């Protein structure tokens, strides 16, 4: 509003426009997201407001929710860069394993926290993971997708990224579980390691088939109930599971083991954030300093 001097437009955020802004009073620099509409639901107000108490070091703090004049403003703690930009910037050399491990570990701590408080992210992707110079990484936009159905096209009709969507969502499941976030994080882990998106689908069916081509078309053996899912079709081609060592080379077996558990088809077999934190892969985790050029 007028209490915020806009510094620059960060982008066309998932729900709306995002600006880097400074509070004229406090001098605090924040990210301000403007969200779209018949007056903006009041149901979302109670919901969003609840997320203000969801405070954790690996969760971008939601400082304030402001509903006014058919506009909804979300004020967030500001971080200078997202993981997508960082991965692009580290494309030639790759993110060092120690840093990949630190980020994965921190993200799992953040998910463990949200999940223990019954909050799901639902739309984890590199762009929603913010990083700073201290080596921290934080989850952004956590429980927002709840009172906002399912993404598809931002106000600028931008294409919704399905690359990190769990198979149960693609198969039409009506109830998401914490497992969807573990799946997305597994996809991100793989991408940090290989420097290439794991399943870059360009349509819902292409996304699903890319997953099937790599992990094998799921069946009742590995995923009880899958053939009864809303969008499951007996006509799906049946692809054999690819040898896992081919998926994220040259990741070591500790890493491959954890990733395999984060990508199990059955949401109920998929590892929890809490359990993943105890995986041997993190035995030598540390907190390196990233090379950020702001």
Binding footprint of ligand X6A on the chain (CB under 6 A) = 10-11, 13, 18, 20, 31, 33, 60, 76, 78-82, 130, 140
Residue pair 243/155 in contact (Cβ under 8 Å)? The answer is no
Length of the chain: 294
Question: Could you tell me the smallest distance in angstroms from the CB atom of residue 84 to ligand X6A?
Answer: 9
The CB-of-8 to ligand X6A minimum distance in angstroms stands at: 7
For the record, the structure tokens of 238 come out as 């049946």
CA distance 106 to 277: 9
**Is 126 assigned to a binding site?**
yes
Say which residue the tokens 């060592």 belong to. Answer: 245
Has 127 been labeled as part of a binding site?
yes
14 vs 102 by CB, closer to ligand X6A = 14
Shortest distance in whole angstroms from residue 247 CB to ligand X6A: 29
Q: Within 10 A of 107 (CB to CB), how many other CB atoms are there?
A: 25
Specify the residue for token string 């199990």.
264
Nearest residue (CB) to ligand X6A, 13 versus 167: 13
Catalytic residue set: 123
Q: Which is nearer to ligand X6A, 6 or 269 (CB)?
A: 6
> Shortest Cβ distance from residue 19 to ligand X6A (Å)?
9
132 is in an annotated binding site: no
Does the annotation place 193 within a ligand binding site?
no
125 annotated ligand-binding residue:
yes
49 vs 245, beta carbon nearer ligand X6A: 49
Cβ-contact 59, 142 below 8 angstroms: yes
Residues annotated in a binding site for ATP: 10-18, 33, 77-79, 82, 125-128, 141
Residues annotated in a binding site for Mg(2+): 128, 141
């Amino acid at each position: 509003m007028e209490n915020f001097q806009k510094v620059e437009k960060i982008g066309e955020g998932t729900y709306g426009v995002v600006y880097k802004a400074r509070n004229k009073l406090t001098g605090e620099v924040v990210a301000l997201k403007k969200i779209r509409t018949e007056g903006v639901p009041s149901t979302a107000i109670r919901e969003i407001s609840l997320l203000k108490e969801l405070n954790h070091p690996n969760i971008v703090k939601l400082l304030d929710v402001i509903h006014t004049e058919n506009k909804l403003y979300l004020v967030f703690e500001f971080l200078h860069q997202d993981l997508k930009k960082f991965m692009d910037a580290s494309a030639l050399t790759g993110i060092p394993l120690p840093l990949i491990k630190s980020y994965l570990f921190q993200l799992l701590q953040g998910l463990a926290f949200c999940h223990s408080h019954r909050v799901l992210h639902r739309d984890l992707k590199p762009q929603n993971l913010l990083i700073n110079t201290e080596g921290a990484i934080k989850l952004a936009d956590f429980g927002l997708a709840r009172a906002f159905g399912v993404p598809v096209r931002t106000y600028t009709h931008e294409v919704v990224t399905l690359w990190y969507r769990a198979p149960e969502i693609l198969l039409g499941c009506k109830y998401y579980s914490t497992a969807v976030d573990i799946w997305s994080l597994g996809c991100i882990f793989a991408e940090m390691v290989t420097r290439r998106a794991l399943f870059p689908g360009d349509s819902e069916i292409d996304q699903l088939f890319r997953i099937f081509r790599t992990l094998g078309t799921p069946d009742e053996v590995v995923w009880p109930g899958v053939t009864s899912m809303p969008d499951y079709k007996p006509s799906f081609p049946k692809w054999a599971r690819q040898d896992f060592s081919k998926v994220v080379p040259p990741l070591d077996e500790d890493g491959r083991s954890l990733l395999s558990q984060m990508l199990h088809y059955d949401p109920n077999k998929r590892i929890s954030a809490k359990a993943a934190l105890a995986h041997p892969f993190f035995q030598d985790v540390t907190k390196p300093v990233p090379h950020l050029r702001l």
